[PDB]
Each structure stands twice: as C-alpha cells, then as structure tokens.
Design a protein around this ligand. Structure first.
Ligand SMILES: N[C@@H](Cc1c[nH]c[nH+]1)C(=O)O
Ligand SMILES: N[C@@H](Cc1c[nH]c[nH+]1)C(=O)O
Ligand SMILES: COc1cccnc1
Ligand SMILES: COc1cccnc1
Lengths: 414, 412
C-alpha cells in the first residue's frame, strides 16, 4: 500500500470538501462580479527576487523557495500582490486606469498548513479613499453572502500615516518606517517587552518608542485629531472613509482601531482587517493602500494602489462555528434507467435529449436491477428517475418517477 | 525596473487572456455538470514516489521534481490520475461506486511550456465500455459547446487488448507489455522504434506482428486476426454501437495505431484530433483497471478517464475563429454629478448590487463626459447619473449604452 495522505500541510479536496470550497469561491467570484472586478491569474512559481523586501516580514521569511535544475532562484508565491504589480508594470501605458482586478491564488509558505487559497481584490490608479471604501464593502458583501451579519464580524480600520508622522517628528529616517510597522504589527502575538526590544535594535530611543505606543492606544479619530491635528491627511481620509461606508449602508460593519498596522512593508495609507466579534479566530482578511510599491519596482510614474487578501481557512472555521456550512449533497436532475441491457441504446438516446435541453443527467452505467438503479438514483440526489422500458418505448414513452410512477411521451420529458 | 516577464515557460493571465481561459473552463465545468461528474482537487505538490513507474514514460521522465529543506522527495504533479487514485484509496470502502469525478488541475513538466491546465474526467467502478462511451461523449460535448463540429474534430479509438494478445502469443512475459505500448506510442522514425523494441528484448518476428496489427484499418480486420469473440472486438463494437445511439457516431472512429504513452492503460484508449492534421492531440484517455491494484488496493477497481489540455484546443479554436475577444461587461456605472453627490451615488450603488446587478461607481474625481467615456470603456449596459436636481425629486438620470429621469425604486 502507498501513502494515501497528502504531502505535509497540504489539503485534499474530495467531492464533499470540494463542495464547501466551491460554495466559498462562488461567493468570491460573485462578489467580484457584483463589484465590477476583472479576473486575472499568474504563475504560482515566481522569481525569488520578487519577494526580497528586506523588512523582516513574516510572509517573506517563511517563503517556500527552491532552485531549479538550471540554477534559477524561484519561489512558490507567498502572496499575490507582487505578481499583480509585475503584470501591471508589464502593461505600462496600455493599461487603462482605473483597474479593478481580482484572483483566487493558492499561496504558499514553509516553516501547520503550508498552503492556502487567498481571494485578492485590488484597485489600481485611484488616489482617493473611495478605493478603500469599495474594497472594504466588497469584503463585507462576501461575508454577508455567506450568511454572516455585522453582529458576527467587523472590519477594523486605521491609517499608517498617523504613525508615519510620529516617527518623522522624533527624527527617525523614513527608511526605518516600514520595519517599525512590521514590528508593531507583532503587539498581540508577542509581549510588549519583546516588541519594545525589537524597536530598540532597529535603532529608536525609549522616548520615540513611547510616542508610538501611546498613539496605538488612542481609541477614536478625535483623539488622533488632538495629537496630530484635524488637517492631518489621515484624519480627513479616515473621516471620508467612514462617511462613505456609512452612506453605502455598511456602517455597522466597520470601526476605527489605532492598533491595526498590518505586517506588510508596503502599506502607506489606510489599512484594515476583518475579525470575528467573539474574539475566537485570527484575522478573516487584511489589506490597505500601497502607493509606492510600483515605484520601488521601477515604475517611471507613481501608481496608487489598494487591495486586500481574504484567506480560505479562517472564514470556514467561523462559518462552521456559526453553523453556516451544512453539507450540500450532490444533486443531478435526471437518472436514466435502462430496464435491462437491450434498452441501453434507447436509454442513451433519451439521455442525449435530456442533456441537450440543459439538464444534468446520469445513465446507469453497469448492469443492475431497477430497484438497485433507483437506490442509486436516490444516493446521487436525483430529482427524477426515467425508466426506459420495452412496453412504454413502443408507445413512444418512458416511465418517470419523482424522487424529492407514470408514463410520459418522449417529447414532453424536457 | 524588475523583470516583468513571467518565469520561463509559465503564462500570465491578465484580464483579456483570463476571459479566454474562463470561457474554456466554463465549458469544462458545464460539461461535467451536464454529465453528472463531481468536482475534486488535490495538492499540486505530491510525493515523488507517486510517479516512479519505471516504464520510460515521457511525463514521468520530464517531471518537475525537487527536494524540500527537510529532505522529502516531492514533485509538482505531471498529471492528475495518480492523485485521483490516492484519494480513491484513502476513501476505501466508504467510497460509493460508481463514482464520476472531475478536476481542472494545473500540471507541470521540466525539460517550451512548463505548465498547462488539464481537464480530467474519470469514471470509477464501472467494468463495462459504457464508461468509455460516456467519457468520449463528454469530450465531444465539450468541443461541440465551444462551437466545434464533427467536421472539425474526431476521436480515434482503439483497445490495447488486441496488442496484449499478439505480444502474449509470441511468448513475451506480460511484464514487457507496458514498456512495449510506451515505445509503440512513439510511431520518431520506424527505424528508431524498431530499435527500441529490440533493446526491450523482443525478436524481429514478434516486432513484425506488432507493426502489422497497428496498420490494420478496421475492426473486421482485427476480427480476422484475433477472432470475432476476442474481448476487444465485442467491446469496441459495443462502444461504437453506444456512441452511435447517443448521437455522436460521426465524431468517433477506429484507429489501431492509437495506444497512448501511459503505462497504466489496459483496455480501450482514445485521443481527439483535428481533421485537418494541423495540431497535436486535443485530449487523451483510456481504461486503467489495474492501477489501483498496483498501488495496493486489496480489491481490483475498474477505472477509465481522460485528460483534455488547455493549449491545443485554444489554438484550434483561434484557427476556426471561435475565440473572438469578449469585452468586459458590467450592468451599471453610477456617476456622481460631482463629489457632493458621492454619498447619494453610493446608496444607489448599494441598491443596484442588492438586486443582483453588476455595478461600478466612478471612484476618482472626473467630469460627466469622461465618466461616460469610462462607462463605455468598461462595457457598461447603462449609466446612472446621480445629479442634485433629480435627487430632490427622488430620481436619477439613466442613459442606455448598448437620457431621462427615473424614480429610485424603479431602477431595479
Ligand atoms: N498581499 C496581502 C493582501 C493584499 C492584497 N492587496 C494588497 N494587500 C496579504 O497577503 O496580506
Ligand atoms: N492522466 C492521463 C489522462 C487520463 C486521466 N484519466 C485517465 N487518463 C494523461 O495525462 O494523459
Ligand atoms: C502566507 O502564505 C500562507 C499562509 C498561511 C497558509 N498557507 C500559506
Ligand atoms: C505534463 O505536463 C505538461 C504538459 C504540457 C505542458 N505543460 C506541462
């Protein structure tokens, strides 16, 4: 006997599990379409150089990389955003903006799960917070579509610009900002002593660290306004953002949280993450504005961007807890049953007709008695059994039985 | 500037190319559903041990394998069938049979394209040729659905059992049969193939009989050589009788040269081809009744299926002009008259989406005429201008793309 288990930290999807995954992806696709996003894809295998950002980020640290036989430094993508950027740069001026692109890539890591699917939604070429508004509303829409309400989940929202200023006022070179965010993102995962220590090695004195901590604890936008001024870009932008989400009708889903910075180096403005309101699960989704990324890759002109990722594992756990993932059995409209093998040719012609009309239909493939054929029909969740028997056939008819009997002319089947 | 091109032999799918791929996959999915197959998936990364069949097969020879940091021998799958088998074995007796499973995995190779998508359709637990009938009909259905007819394409059909007997009559141990098929599938010059069979260990007389039967042009001529009640004859006849009865007789034909390159096929094999002789095989498959036994199934489990790649079909469809660009479309584009109307425009956008419509809103600041140009560019069916005067009347202004006032409730 061979190894029946999948490779370590990778999931199989037999039909039952695949139906659950399809249920979820159908929502991702349908939400994208509802919101006017266009699908794209790129190779799971990308060049390693694409993820070397040197900011101590977790997803680049835990990158499932290797070397080809020809010596090229490649990686299974740990995220999609750099791929998106590559594609955008490749198009250059031929790309019409604004663009709204989405995908559902499998993404990888190595250290626990080594593999997940991550819905990515990104808006390209929009300077204003309307992009972040749309993105956050998309994420809410998807969760709404899976049966969740604003009682079950929320989206925490912040801007890194508040922190950008505090760092800049202390005198720390702007090069240190991305590392600072990556470290401060660790506040829940490790103790405050551990994070204070990490910022010390980065090269910031205790007074600068104190100001950082203080602003993360600020509980409202007014309290930000007091600290940095009402004219501060972050204040106007966050206000516009909440005003717009409120107007769209998702005010109950969103709130301000000054502790949210995200772990990625490249976010420059508004950032956000989804969470369950019971405090039981890790983040459901996460994203933000990243206006300089394409400039760092060498775009001759700055290109504003914003987007998010929405994983496939935490959401499912939440949905299972809330009892929103009942098994959906397999279904098919018709099961065609030859009375015996001599009727098979006739049964095949019926099967053809049924399928031609857009119905999903099986035919009993092996030899079996009608009662067993009917049992099989019930097992595959057939709505209807179509028995093709000799007496009825000579009258131009079949015998039909609803699952969930009597003669019917062949033309009236469809 | 960073490298904008993808990794060697891998494809990008920006929206235009992705639409084409979606058009194709929608057919694969819709065909599977029409035929009652159930979707499954498995990891692109599988254990290397799963593909070491030692028969000199091309897809195992060209396998994109590597070693993890922890030293485990893994591979990016070159095909799906072994994964399927693993999954089937894992279920064991809890698997209800017959089962009809399908998937659309990306599969890999290393040597030219390193990567393709391959629709897989497999029927499990059906002894009889009805499985192969259904599978072949599924493949025809898919091509029909893409706009192809039996004038454009066909499916060549054969059984390896004919060749199995010829080999067995010559006295060659049954262990040599799979290698023989893998070599004969290469029909490189005849001199090169004759040579390969010689090293496998068959004498010239045994090689001659093989060659002869591959050149036989009809089932009757098979019947003459091996007898009318040889399993292959009865089975092929049943197969054509059933495909004929289903209504796809014009799509299928017999070809004794078709054996396929995979070690594990035991019975009927088939491959799709364009009737102009311009392209490589469109799809390929067959019965493989012993595979699950070789993996250690305590009971033999009959199987049959095929793979249907995503590259050749597209080339064929492009030649036949059956892949026009499908522009992106959206039902509505909501246009704020100016920024002060944005909150109102957002409420309208909400309502439109609530009713199942696809809708954009103009995100950045722009004049109405430019907003309308953008609406046309994204292929909007309708522009909904949200302007102050109309709003005070409980209305918006609507213009069809492909103007006048409308009450807000009548938009949807
Ligand atoms: N790549 C981010 C999500 C994202 C998409 N776009 C912007 N951010 C992540 O993996 O967390
Ligand atoms: N695995 C085969 C196709 C197939 C699927 N099932 C049976 N045959 C191939 O790659 O050519
Ligand atoms: C970042 O890549 C991941 C994360 C979690 C699971 N699998 C892959
Ligand atoms: C078998 O793997 C393949 C085949 C063709 C193209 N790309 C990968």
């Amino acid at each position: 006997m061979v190894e029946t288990e999948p490779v370590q930290g990778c999931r199989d999807f037999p039909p039952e599990a695949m139906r659950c995954r399809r249920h979820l992806f159908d929502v991702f696709h349908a939400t994208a379409k509802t919101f006017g996003f266009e699908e794209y894809d790129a190779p799971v295998l990308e060049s390693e150089e694409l993820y070397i950002r040197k900011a101590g980020e977790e997803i680049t640290e835990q990158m499932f990389n290797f070397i080809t036989k020809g010596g090229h430094r490649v990686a299974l993508r740990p995220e999609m955003t750099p791929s998106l950027a590559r594609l955008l740069l490749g198009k250059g001026r031929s790309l019409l903006l604004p663009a709204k692109w989405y995908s559902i890539p499998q993404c990888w890591r190595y250290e626990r799960r080594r593999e997940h699917y991550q819905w990515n939604m990104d808006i390209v070429g929009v300077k204003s917070v309307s992009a972040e508004v749309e993105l956050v509303c998309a994420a809410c829409w998807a969760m709404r579509s899976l049966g969740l309400s604003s009682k079950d989940v929320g989206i925490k929202v912040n801007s890194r610009k508040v922190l950008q200023t505090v760092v800049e006022q202390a005198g720390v070179t702007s090069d240190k900002f991305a590392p600072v965010c990556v470290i401060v993102d660790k506040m829940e995962k490790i103790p405050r002593e551990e994070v204070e220590a990490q910022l010390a090695v980065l090269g910031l004195e205790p007074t600068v660290v104190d100001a950082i901590t203080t602003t993360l604890s600020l509980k409202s936008i007014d309290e930000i306004a007091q600290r940095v001024g009402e004219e501060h870009e972050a204040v106007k932008e966050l206000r516009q953002f909440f005003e717009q989400v409120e107007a769209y009708g998702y005010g109950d889903w969103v709130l301000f949280d000054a502790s949210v910075v995200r772990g990625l180096a490249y976010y420059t403005g508004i950032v956000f993450e989804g969470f369950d309101r019971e405090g039981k699960f890790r983040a459901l989704c996460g994203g933000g504005r990243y206006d300089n990324l394409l400039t760092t890759y060498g775009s001759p002109t700055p290109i504003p961007c914003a987007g998010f990722g929405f994983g496939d594992c935490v959401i499912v756990e939440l949905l299972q807890e809330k009892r929103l993932l009942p098994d959906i059995p397999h279904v098919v409209d018709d099961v065609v049953i030859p009375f015996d093998e001599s009727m098979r040719p006739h049964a095949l012609a019926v099967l053809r007709r049924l399928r031609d009309a857009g119905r999903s239909a099986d035919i009993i493939l092996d030899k079996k008695k009608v009662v067993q054929a009917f049992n099989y029909a019930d097992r595959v969740g057939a709505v209807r059994a179509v028995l093709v028997a000799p007496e009825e056939w000579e009258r131009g008819e079949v015998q039909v039985k609803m699952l969930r009997g009597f003669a019917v002319p062949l033309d009236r089947l469809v």
